[PDB]
Amino acid sequence: NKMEAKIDELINNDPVWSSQNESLISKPYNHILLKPGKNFRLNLIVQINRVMNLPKDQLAIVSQIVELLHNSSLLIDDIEDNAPLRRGQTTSHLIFGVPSTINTANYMYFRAMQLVSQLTTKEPLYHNLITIFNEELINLHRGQGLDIYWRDFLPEIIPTQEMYLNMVMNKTGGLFRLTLRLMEALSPHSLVPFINLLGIIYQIRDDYLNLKDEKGFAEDITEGKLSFPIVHALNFTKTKGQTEQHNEILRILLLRTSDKDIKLKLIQILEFDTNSLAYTKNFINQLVNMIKNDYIIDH
Amino acid sequence: NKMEAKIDELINNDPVWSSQNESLISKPYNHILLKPGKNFRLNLIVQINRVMNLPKDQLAIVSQIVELLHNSSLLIDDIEDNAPLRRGQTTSHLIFGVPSTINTANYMYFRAMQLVSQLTTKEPLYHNLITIFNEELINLHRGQGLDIYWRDFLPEIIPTQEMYLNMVMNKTGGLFRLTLRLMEALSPSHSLVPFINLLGIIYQIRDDYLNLKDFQMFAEDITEGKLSFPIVHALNFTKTKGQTEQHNEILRILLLRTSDKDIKLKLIQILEFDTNSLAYTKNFINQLVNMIKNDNENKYLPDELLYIIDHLSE
Ligand SMILES: O=P(O)(O)C(O)(Cc1cccc(-c2cccc3c2oc2ccccc23)c1)P(=O)(O)O
Ligand SMILES: O=P(O)(O)C(O)(Cc1cccc(-c2cccc3c2oc2ccccc23)c1)P(=O)(O)O
Ligand SMILES: O=P(O)(O)C(O)(Cc1cccc(-c2cccc3c2oc2ccccc23)c1)P(=O)(O)O
Ligand SMILES: O=P(O)(O)C(O)(Cc1cccc(-c2cccc3c2oc2ccccc23)c1)P(=O)(O)O
């Protein structure tokens, strides 16, 4: 009969997937492309290439891979932080919903992975590009897992500066290392230590500017993040016996508040009571002087 | 002095990660392991192996891969359907939160991928295994993305039965094909892929059917507004017969995202008395199983397998 014949045809062919289908599920992703991201990224990749010297067409693919992983990971990051804005517009998950956004972001992680084989035909080198991809993706999720856990289960764990830096080495260092390691493996004195330093500077600076200044006003406070200035402050208050301030910092973080005055109060506690903002600014300058007093690093 | 020296050490070493850090991010995953569920998956693998003959240690790994992807995919599946229960207990995202559960599930996807790399060191075969893994994960997400889309954009698109089957081929068939293709690529010793595709289709339709049938005998699929196989039949049946009020009433209840049992029973009544969608589905599953039962030639089958098939019969 015809039903059996049609079922037979179905199971003997590859799953049917159309262009229209590809478009429908790409919506959460297409939305974040509507706004440009730091364009100075292909900029960073172009700099590092002065040293790696990859051929233009191979470099392009590395760039596409990292751009894709980066843009899609932001979709997930914003769900995980329940963020309202990204690149000055509403986050995808508030528009298309959390379910679609998770699935689309995860879909793009595997599309990124598929691009890797466009880099080489040589089994050995391929094997190493894949291992690098797998390793850093593992590191990336270990660090983000720690960051989310500390924030969502606060005050169960109050991280020390040491713990925060290790989380960053996993998370933000993971994407910087991913980009550098792929290029070093493709290139015809590794820069890994230098790229780890850059990732840390970047994350701490990112935490700092969030309070010093589109994602909204000091949105890291609304999200309750254990940011670099917050970690210094929680440890500073514990160490100095400032019991009341230590507890009020925790309380404000736990409110997940959008109240601008409450956020401003916390920011001035970091300014005048714990001097965490100045501590952070100096810490950043000290890391930068590690490069300078030893060009990309200029941002 | 000191700070700089601590930073030098940090950036020159691999990222620090401990056993304690591993236990913390594994919490959402271990929770679902608290109940084994219908873990007889290891059985289908173990059985298919009688034809594939993979050495016991490679078989263990394929096994771990399948268990990891399947377990972590339910963590994500439950967040995507906002499900309250899984394997009889509160879903992980409701205990550990949506953020940690997504991250933990995604972490396990990559730990599964790293196991793939440990199946062989033959560089060519390795590339093939990675290609299979990559291809099926992509089909899986396309299928799940389409199922979610219809559900969340309802009533913009009402899929037909043919559309539903293509979605299922991508989604459900993705993990069955993934296990089978890996096993087949590894075998020392006609693909069983067509057979496994059919199994995945039977499995999913049967799953849609029992979700409504066990309630007739939670029916969370109704609360989620899912375009399940019986609901798809019911929507196209009412459209075809020009039954406007019934068509609309089915949409209204799905759109309600209701957990009110009397309303859920009302949709089931519609399916039972107006469209006869449950009898239709039962019969459709029977016709699929019979394609295996009457495969005298063994066009699809290589007995322990047929038993499974007949079991799935409704
Ligand atoms: O892309 P966006 O400008 O939205 C932003 O994520 C900037 C950013 C934050 C963190 C990491 C990166 C980053 C780091 C390393 C490499 C690359 C990054 O972004 C891209 C894009 C394209 C290629 C490589 C990278 C960019 P944002 O915090 O300013 O929103
Ligand atoms: O570190 P922040 O989250 O503060 C930020 O830099 C963005 C960011 C930087 C580096 C990594 C990630 C991130 C977060 C969640 C998941 C993943 C991330 O990066 C990858 C890459 C590939 C897969 C998953 C993830 C986000 P921001 O642009 O939101 O300021
Ligand atoms: O794991 P649970 O027992 O929780 C459940 O997913 C049922 C189930 C149990 C075991 C395996 C599977 C399953 C699902 C999709 C694909 C495959 C499954 O098992 C195998 C084995 C070999 C290949 C593919 C699959 C489903 P449930 O729907 O009853 O919650
Ligand atoms: O298809 P249903 O959601 O009805 C169910 O069969 C479970 C299921 C089967 C097959 C695939 C999936 C699924 C859903 C979302 C994401 C992913 C799924 O399977 C994988 C494997 C690997 C990565 C992601 C996913 C879920 P159930 O046990 O919840 O009834």
Swiss-Prot record, chain B:
GO terms for biological process: farnesyl diphosphate biosynthetic process; geranyl diphosphate biosynthetic process; geranylgeranyl diphosphate biosynthetic process; isoprenoid biosynthetic process; protein transport; terpenoid biosynthetic process. Changing residue 109 to A: Reduced affinity for isopentenyl diphosphate (IPP). It comes from the Eukaryota. This is Geranylgeranyl pyrophosphate synthase BTS1. InterPro entries: Isoprenoid_synthase_dom_sf, Polyprenyl_synt, Polyprenyl_synt_CS. Mg(2+) 2 binds at residues 77, 81. Catalyzes the trans-addition of the 3 molecules of IPP onto DMAPP to form geranylgeranyl pyrophosphate. Required for the membrane attachment of YPT1 and SEC4. May be involved in vesicle trafficking and protein sorting. GO terms for cellular component: mitochondrion. One of its GO terms (molecular function) is dimethylallyltranstransferase activity. The gene is BTS1. The keyword Cytoplasm applies. It is found in: Cytoplasm. It is an enzyme of class 2 (transferase). The record marks 109 as: Important for determining product chain length. Keywords: Carotenoid biosynthesis, Cytoplasm, Isoprene biosynthesis, Magnesium, Metal-binding, Protein transport, Transferase, Transport. Dimethylallyl diphosphate binds at residues 86, 171-172, 204, 211, 226. SUPFAM superfamilies: Terpenoid synthases. Its cofactor is Mg(2+). PROSITE patterns: POLYPRENYL_SYNTHASE_1 (PS00723), POLYPRENYL_SYNTHASE_2 (PS00444).
